[PDB]
C-alpha cells in the first residue's frame, strides 16, 4: 500500500504504473486482484 492507497485503487501513482508496459501492469493488477 502507501502512495495514497495505490493511487486510490489504480488511479495513477506508483511511478506512473512503473512506466507502463509489463502486460499493462499485469492486466491492471489482476483486474484489481493483486
Curated annotation (Swiss-Prot):
Tissue expr:
Specifically expressed in epithelial cells. Component of brush border microvilli.
Query: What does the record say about PTM?
Result: Phosphorylated on tyrosine residues. The unphosphorylated form increases the initial rate of actin-nucleating activity, whereas the tyrosine-phosphorylated form inhibits actin-nucleating activity, enhances actin-bundling activity and enhances actin-severing activity by reducing high Ca(2+) requirements. The tyrosine-phosphorylated form does not regulate actin-capping activity.
Name the residues that span the membrane: none
Region annotated Absolutely required for activity sits at: 29-32
Q: Which Cys pairs does UniProt list as disulfide-bonded?
A: none
Q: Report the locations given in the UniProt record.
A: Cytoplasm, Cytoskeleton; Cell projection, Microvillus; Cell projection, Lamellipodium; Cell projection, Ruffle
Reproduce the free-text note on domains from the UniProt record.
Answer: Consists of a large core fragment in the N-terminal portion and a small headpiece (HP) in the C-terminal portion. The core fragment is necessary for both actin-nucleating and -severing activities, whereas the HP binds F-actin strongly in both the presence and absence of calcium and is necessary in actin-bundling activity. The Gelsolin-like 1 repeat is necessary for the actin-capping activity. The entire core fragment is necessary for the actin-severing activity.
Its biological purpose is as follows: Epithelial cell-specific Ca(2+)-regulated actin-modifying protein that modulates the reorganization of microvillar actin filaments. Plays a role in the actin nucleation, actin filament bundle assembly, actin filament capping and severing. Binds phosphatidylinositol 4,5-bisphosphate (PIP2) and lysophosphatidic acid (LPA); binds LPA with higher affinity than PIP2. Binding to LPA increases its phosphorylation by SRC and inhibits all actin-modifying activities. Binding to PIP2 inhibits actin-capping and -severing activities but enhances actin-bundling activity.
Q: Member of which family?
A: Belongs to the villin/gelsolin family.
Q: How does it assemble?
A: Monomer. Homodimer. Associates with F-actin; the association with F-actin is inhibited by tropomyosin.
Q: What is this protein called?
A: Villin-1
Which organism does this sequence originate in?
Gallus gallus
The gene designation is VIL1
Of the parent protein, the shown chain spans 792 to 825 of 826
Amino acid at each position: 500500500x502507501x502512495x495514497x492507497x495505490x493511487x486510490x485503487x489504480x488511479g495513477x501513482x506508483x511511478x506512473x504504473x512503473x512506466x507502463x508496459x509489463x502486460x499493462x501492469x499485469x492486466x491492471x493488477x489482476x483486474x484489481x486482484g493483486x
